[PDB]
Design a protein around this nucleic acid. Sequence first.
DNA 1: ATGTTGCTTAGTCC
DNA 2: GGACTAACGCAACA
Length: 219
Amino acid sequence: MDREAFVQTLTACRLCPRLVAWREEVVGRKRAFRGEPYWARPVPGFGDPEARILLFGLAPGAHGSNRTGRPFTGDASGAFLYPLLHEAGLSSKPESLPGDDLRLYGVYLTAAVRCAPPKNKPTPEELRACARWTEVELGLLPEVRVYVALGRIALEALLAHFGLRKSAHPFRHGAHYPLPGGRHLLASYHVSRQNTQTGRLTREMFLEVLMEAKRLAGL
DNA sequence: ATGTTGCTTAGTCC
DNA sequence: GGACTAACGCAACA
Ligand code: SF4
Ligand SMILES: O=P([O-])(O)O
Ligand SMILES: O=P([O-])(O)O
């Protein structure tokens, strides 16, 4: 199917009852956004369809993409990520606002799970379910040369996608593994506020991941 | 009030 | 693998 079909069918997905419930349950639970409209639906990926770089996240944040409808948009992860994408020369502007004209250059964003999960922790079954969308979505990104896993969950999800063994591909920030066809699998700590605000992942460190991804992608 | 909640990683055990 | 939890730093939240 093409992207239009992907987005249409994805947005109507209700395979995970716990997530179908949670994505709506959180609406109105955060003071700053009470009364505001929430996407509260599966989150389609965003970015350059001809991207050479794929940034693969964990899942929608309750008041992030689950609210705005766009990956990493509206939360602390995006406040950290988007400016760095621009600093690396991979986007039209530093900020991401729903409905704006933000363009990503050579990069596409999505995640392992597409509906907000309780405690930001999807179950193995939920991951297995949404992996079907990963197959469809990644199939629509023919030019990707570098797959960047943001966090352990994201990495394990990509390993499953590529049929790679976890034992041979451990999660460590900066890890780099070869993929068939001269492609690359990179691992980075996730951009979550609890990684960036604690100093586990600094702006310097993540920008480096982006610059390396560009180098490996021929950009 | 100022204590609690919420935002992934690296150890433990099965 | 999968379930459980101590530990970061910060600030919205109550
Ligand atoms: S997480 Fe994925 S598979 Fe599960 S309901 Fe949402 S879109 Fe469907
Ligand atoms: O909701 P966001 O997860 O994609 O940060
Ligand atoms: O945000 P304030 O809750 O402490 O009033």
